[PDB]
Design a protein around this ligand. Structure first.
Ligand SMILES: [Cl-]
Ligand SMILES: [Cl-]
Ligand SMILES: [Cl-]
Length: 163
């Protein structure tokens, strides 16, 4: 475990993370995809061997000894708000199980279902609150990765609000 488990946020490419493992914002088919998923495919292509997994699940594949946790959030274009919210919560619960199983002291994580799976909505708060619900009982240092300067400010504020 980390000595004083923390949340932090950085605005940069998660493929350049300084943590002991990464969470990919994966598609269910283990395809290279776009956005975070394509950055992850470029950096750790070996981790896409048998990475396909259903919505609401996470599947870990090792790139060398570096764990890539493929977490499949719902595409809100296809899911109802209600069913999508349930699957987005479930994906983060499976990430916390994997992070625990791996014994890592730190994890790099993106906000699931906030990009091309958002169904054109702002889901910062929805996705971040499900991340916290899952990860709060883990003792890994969590580093959240984002690309937008105003998202960076809002995530940092939400972390600081809990102290
Ligand atoms: Cl960058
Ligand atoms: Cl997304
Ligand atoms: Cl972002």
């Amino acid at each position: 475990g980390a000595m004083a488990p923390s949340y932090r946020v950085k605005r940069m490419d998660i493929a350049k993370n300084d943590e002991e493992c990464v969470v990919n914002a994966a598609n269910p088919r283990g395809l290279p995809g776009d956005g975070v998923c394509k950055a992850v495919y470029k950096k750790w292509p070996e981790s896409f061997k048998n990475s396909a997994t259903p919505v609401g699940t996470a599947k870990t594949v090792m790139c060398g000894t570096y764990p890539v946790i493929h977490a499949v959030g719902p595409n809100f274009s296809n899911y109802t708000e209600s069913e999508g919210d349930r699957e987005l919560a479930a994906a983060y619960r499976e990430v916390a199980k994997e992070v625990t199983r791996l014994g890592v002291n730190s994890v790099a994580i993106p906000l699931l279902s906030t990009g091309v799976y958002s169904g054109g909505k702002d889901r910062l708060t929805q996705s971040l609150n499900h991340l916290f619900t899952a990860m709060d009982s883990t003792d890994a240092d969590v580093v959240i990765y984002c690309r937008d300067k105003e998202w960076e400010k809002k995530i940092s504020e939400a972390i600081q609000m809990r102290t």
